[PDB]
Design a protein around this ligand. Structure first.
Ligand code: NA
Ligand code: NA
Ligand code: NA
Length: 133
């Protein structure tokens, strides 16, 4: 869909408001670094994985095969109990709640490869600097 992209500090603030800072021991800077490499802060971001017909959705690019139902991913399991479309709305409440569910599993935030490659073990302070959070 046409993009609906937050501004770095507005998302930082919203995520903070929604209880993301420190959630599961994950700092806001880390959630910001994730959203950045994942969707570029684009809440409408979708990405089709031709390998298993799955698609990644919204800000956190959550996968339809395990987390949200998109009604088009064969053999999917809906762990968040949400429609993937719910993860593509300007209001990121449902999205944040699913992201929380995702990092509650054993691998936490390491479930996202991009986070592992871009954010993990690296200085991420740049992501929240200036935001007043
Ligand atoms: Na602005
Ligand atoms: Na502006
Ligand atoms: Na605001």
């Amino acid at each position: 869909a046409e993009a609906k992209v937050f501004e770095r500090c507005e998302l930082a603030r919203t995520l903070k408001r929604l209880g993301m800072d420190g959630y599961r021991g994950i700092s806001l800077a880390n959630w910001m670094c994730l959203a950045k490499w994942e969707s570029g802060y684009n809440t409408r971001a979708t990405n089709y994985n031709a390998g298993d017909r799955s698609t990644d959705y919204g800000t956190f690019q959550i996968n339809s095969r395990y987390w949200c139902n998109d009604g088009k991913t064969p053999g999917a399991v809906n762990a968040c109990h949400l429609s993937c479309s719910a993860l593509l709305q300007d209001n990121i409440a449902d999205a944040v709640a699913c992201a929380k569910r995702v990092v509650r599993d054993p691998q936490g935030i390491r479930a996202w490869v991009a986070w592992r490659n871009r954010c993990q073990n690296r200085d991420v302070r740049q992501y929240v600097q200036g935001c007043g959070v």
